[PDB]
Amino acid sequence: TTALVCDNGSGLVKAGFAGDDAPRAVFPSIVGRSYVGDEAQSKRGILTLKYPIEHGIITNWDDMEKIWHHTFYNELRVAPEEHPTLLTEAPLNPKANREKMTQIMFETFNVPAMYVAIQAVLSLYASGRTTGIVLDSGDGVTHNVPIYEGYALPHAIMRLDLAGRDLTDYLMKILTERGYSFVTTAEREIVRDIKEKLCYVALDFENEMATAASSSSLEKSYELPDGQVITIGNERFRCPETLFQPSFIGMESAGIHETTYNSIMKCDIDIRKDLYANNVMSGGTTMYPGIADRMQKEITALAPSTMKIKIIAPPERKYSVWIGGSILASLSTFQQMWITKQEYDEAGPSIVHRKCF
Amino acid sequence: QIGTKLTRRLSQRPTAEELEQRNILKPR
Ligand SMILES: Nc1ncnc2c1ncn2[C@@H]1O[C@H](COP(=O)(O)OP(=O)(O)OP(=O)(O)O)[C@@H](O)[C@H]1O
Ligand SMILES: C/C1=C/C(=O)O[C@@H]2C[C@@H](CC[C@H](C)/C=C\CC1)O[C@@](O)([C@@H]1CSC(=O)N1)C2
Ligand SMILES: [Mg+2]
Numbered sequence: 001t002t003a004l005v006c007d008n009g010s011g012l013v014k015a016g017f018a019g020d021d022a023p024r025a026v027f028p029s030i031v032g033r034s035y036v037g038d039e040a041q042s043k044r045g046i047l048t049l050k051y052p053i054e055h056g057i058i059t060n061w062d063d064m065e066k067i068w069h070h071t072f073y074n075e076l077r078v079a080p081e082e083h084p085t086l087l088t089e090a091p092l093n094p095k096a097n098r099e100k101m102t103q104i105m106f107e108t109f110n111v112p113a114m115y116v117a118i119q120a121v122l123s124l125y126a127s128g129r130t131t132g133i134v135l136d137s138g139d140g141v142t143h144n145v146p147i148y149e150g151y152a153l154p155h156a157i158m159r160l161d162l163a164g165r166d167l168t169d170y171l172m173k174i175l176t177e178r179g180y181s182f183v184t185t186a187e188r189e190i191v192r193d194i195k196e197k198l199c200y201v202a203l204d205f206e207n208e209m210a211t212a213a214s215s216s217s218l219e220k221s222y223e224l225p226d227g228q229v230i231t232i233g234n235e236r237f238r239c240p241e242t243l244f245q246p247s248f249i250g251m252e253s254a255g256i257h258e259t260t261y262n263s264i265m266k267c268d269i270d271i272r273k274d275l276y277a278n279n280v281m282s283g284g285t286t287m288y289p290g291i292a293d294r295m296q297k298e299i300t301a302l303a304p305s306t307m308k309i310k311i312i313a314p315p316e317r318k319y320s321v322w323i324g325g326s327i328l329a330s331l332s333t334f335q336q337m338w339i340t341k342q343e344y345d346e347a348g349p350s351i352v353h354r355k356c357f
Numbered sequence: 358q359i360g361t362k363l364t365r366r367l368s369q370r371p372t373a374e375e376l377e378q379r380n381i382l383k384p385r
Contacts, residue, residue, distance in 0.1 A: 155383040
């Protein structure tokens with residue numbers, strides 16, 4: 001039999017079979033009330049759409065059950081009782097939530113076995129590492145997660161409620177300042193597309209701003225669904241600059257470069273070196289051209305000159321969490337780590353705490 | 358060799374208790 005891997009994001013579900021190079025199912029994490037994912041969107045003007053996962057944490061369990069059902073039966077076309085299933089969770093996911101995921105997998109879906117891994121840990125594993133610090137940033141939440149020998153270090157984890165959806169909202173705001181108007185849910189989707197296709201991170205923000213002066217060499221045109229053509233200029237890099245300057249959207253938080261530094265500085269002196277040399281980026285919001293080079297530059301400025309800095313950001317990093325799960329679930333020596341149905345029946349949902357770490 | 362090497366790095370993984378004893382693993 002084959003293991004399943006499901007990475008349930010605030011924005012997108014990534015699901016597929018262990019051993020595959022990529023998730024075969026990638027679809028919106030929405031339920032419309034009934035309808036799930038891409039079917040829900042197409043039927044939006046009759047159903048009422050909702051995101052069951054908020055900032056990486058499951059908040060609507062009845063809708064989450066719908067997502068998992070749709071994942072097994074409609075996307076993957078499997079019987080869940082025939083497949084061990086690896087799920088993912090956010091750093092700092094509450095104990096009760098892990099228990100509820102476990103209870104549902106065994107009691108509702110009758111999986112023969114399951115496991116739940118921290119998303120950032122899987123990102124690290126996908127790069128062939130067990131020690132490093134991961135910047136994982138998706139649609140709903142961003143974390144800095146230092147990890148030593150597979151263990152996320154809870155006291156040093158940084159959570160930031162600034163991610164992809166927030167960047168989309170900010171881009172709507174600043175494009176609206178240039179004379180355009182993006183306000184509705186439908187219009188937000190257009191702006192998400194603009195963001196994904198045209199935004200980038202400047203190496204030197206102030207210099208890039210000054211460049212948007214000397215010229216229009218940074219300007220791109222974008223055709224709207226109604227055929228109107230708009231022009232985007234310094235918004236291309238002002239949008240993700242917010243990750244380095246959260247004050248752009250009024251947040252008091254330090255930017256992702258400083259929170260990376262702060263996270264490392266909370267860790268044991270003798271592992272700091274290993275964290276600096278193994279900075280892995282994962283998630284859709286790390287996909288901006290220029291982001292790795294900018295992180296390299298900002299971390300170098302904060303760190304001792306004695307420190308070797310390495311940013312690891314592979315082309316496939318949008319899916320590194322899923323890919324890490326695919327690798328882990330396919331390991332021969334991982335088979336002893338699954339929670340089996342037998343162990344569950346004997347121990348109940350709390351089994352997840354002693355098996356999944 | 359991700360799978361193999363990761364298997365090896367995961368093979369000799371320490372326990373939570375011994376990372377705690379070494380002041381590496383701490384509660385929030
Ligand atoms: N090429 C890109 N450039 C910038 N942003 C992108 C790009 N591709 C995807 N994104 C953004 O990434 C976000 C979703 O990515 P991802 O699937 O990693 O999030 P998620 O796993 O669902 O969320 P989370 O981990 O926060 O719960 C969206 O906001 C999306 O617009
Ligand atoms: C194209 C693909 C992108 C994605 O990231 O989609 C996810 C999930 C999606 C759910 C609603 C949307 C209407 C469904 C289809 C979009 C799915 O909302 C997001 O777009 C939200 C709204 S805009 C913001 O950037 N993230 C992200
Ligand atoms: Mg994610």
